């Protein structure tokens, strides 16, 4: 059940999120820093 899941995930790279899509994705490390900055920012964290 693991090999099939990995094969499907790599077949559809959109499942990895914008950071890991591979189309100019910044990367996991930059993505989580961006998410932290969003966390401090009230406008993007909440619906407002």
């Amino acid at each position: 059940n693991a090999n099939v899941v990995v094969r499907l995930l790599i077949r559809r790279p959109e499942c990895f999120g914008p950071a890991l899509r591979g189309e100019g994705g910044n990367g996991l490390l930059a993505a989580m820093e961006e998410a932290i900055k969003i966390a401090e920012d009230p406008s993007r964290d909440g619906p407002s």
Partner: protein, 394 residues
């Protein structure tokens, strides 16, 4: 009734491009010595720029099932969908593979695609998956069909990188359909008969003068000229010529009388052509148009034509015989016959005359594989070492 692609058949892998509103046709190419990476050769601009199919021709060596291939890794048949194929480059003799080392260009997971000497390992093998809904896993392989190839080693589709400024073949999970077109069939070929893409010498007269360019005095402008010469040039590399058909598909078919083609000087890499001054001059690949570079073989000196033939998909009739047959070259558009100037080693010039002399017959002699390979290596090496010298001079 309908042909099926089988092993030991020489094929060219073709892909289509729709860049900038325009439908372009491309083929997979890779030089043997030097760069092992693979580039794309344009085939849609065949009229304006001649394609170089010698490095694009591939041979289908074995087709094995996935389980049989796995057992082999643990340790003349027709292609069937769902099998593993071993692609061998015709010129180099090496095998197509995934390199697993990438340029890291715009794709996180990409693996570059190149040529590999060793057949061991699963990197060389590729699995053929039919893409069309009509085609089902286990169907007979169609002559005209679109295939998606999956790497055995990396499970990455062979695709064209559309986003990159320069189009590149790469192995990734994004899929692109590839169309295979037969170039020739080795078994059905007849010995002693001219075929497309065969390196040969043009011999004239009993003195056996060979149509060649001047020697290695390093002057490109006068190397561009052509003349009849005899002596050791017949066993020298300058007398080597290759015949490329104007058609792409089934380009290895038996050449017939009145069939237009192109002549390329293997050592120089340039193509024979006729200028407006009614003089022969080798021209560059970029400016080598179909009109100027068109030449044909006609059985008899008589000017009356037999009309036109209908092009057939297959080897065809063995209508041209090596040595025994006597041929006369005529430019397709102008209709003129190139003849020796005769105004006087011998160094007799080649001129374009619609009357010509009585003895304008040209015999055909087949070059050896080793000599053809050596001439191609010489051209590909002199090009690189001229680029290096120019860079150092700058």
């Amino acid at each position: 009734e309908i042909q099926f692609l089988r092993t030991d058949d020489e094929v060219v892998l073709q892909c289509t491009a729709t860049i900038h509103k325009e439908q372009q046709k491309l083929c997979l190419a890779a030089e043997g010595f030097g760069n092992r990476l693979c580039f794309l050769e344009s085939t849609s601009n065949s009229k304006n720029v001649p394609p170089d199919l010698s490095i694009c021709t591939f041979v289908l060596e074995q087709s094995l099932s996935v389980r049989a291939l796995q057992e082999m890794l643990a340790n003349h048949r027709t292609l069937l969908y769902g099998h593993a194929i071993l692609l061998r480059h015709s010129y180099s003799g090496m095998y197509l593979c995934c390199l697993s080392t990438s340029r890291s260009s715009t794709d996180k997971l990409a693996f570059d695609v190149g040529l590999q000497e060793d057949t061991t390992g699963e990197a060389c093998w590729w699995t053929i998956h039919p893409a069309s809904k009509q085609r089902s896993e286990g169907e007979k392989v169609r002559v005209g069909d679109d295939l998606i190839l999956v790497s055995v080693s990396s499970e990455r589709y062979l695709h064209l990188s559309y986003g990159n400024g320069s189009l590149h073949v790469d192995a990734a999970f994004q899929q692109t359909l590839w169309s295979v077109a037969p170039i020739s069939s080795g078994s059905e070929a007849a010995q002693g008969y001219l075929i497309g893409g065969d390196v040969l010498r043009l011999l004239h007269g009993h003195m056996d003068e060979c149509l060649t360019v001047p020697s290695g005095e390093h002057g490109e402008e006068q190397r561009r000229t052509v003349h009849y010469e005899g002596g050791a040039v017949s066993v020298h590399a300058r007398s080597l010529w290759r015949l490329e058909t104007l058609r792409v598909a089934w380009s290895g078919s038996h050449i017939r009388w009145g069939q237009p083609f192109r002549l390329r000087h293997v050592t120089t890499g340039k193509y024979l052509s006729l200028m407006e001054d009614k003089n022969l001059l080798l021209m560059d690949k970029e400016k080598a148009d179909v009109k100027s570079t068109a030449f044909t073989f006609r059985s008899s000196k008589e000017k009356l034509d037999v009309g036109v033939r209908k092009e057939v998909d297959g080897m065809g009739t063995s209508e041209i015989k090596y040595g025994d047959s006597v041929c006369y070259i005529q430019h397709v558009d102008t209709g003129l016959w190139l003849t020796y100037q005769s105004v006087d080693s011998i160094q007799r010039k080649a001129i374009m005359h619609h009357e010509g002399h009585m003895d304008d017959g040209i015999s055909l002699s087949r070059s050896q594989h080793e000599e053809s390979r050596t001439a191609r290596v010489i051209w590909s090496t002199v090009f690189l070492f001229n680029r290096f010298i120019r860079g150092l001079d700058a």
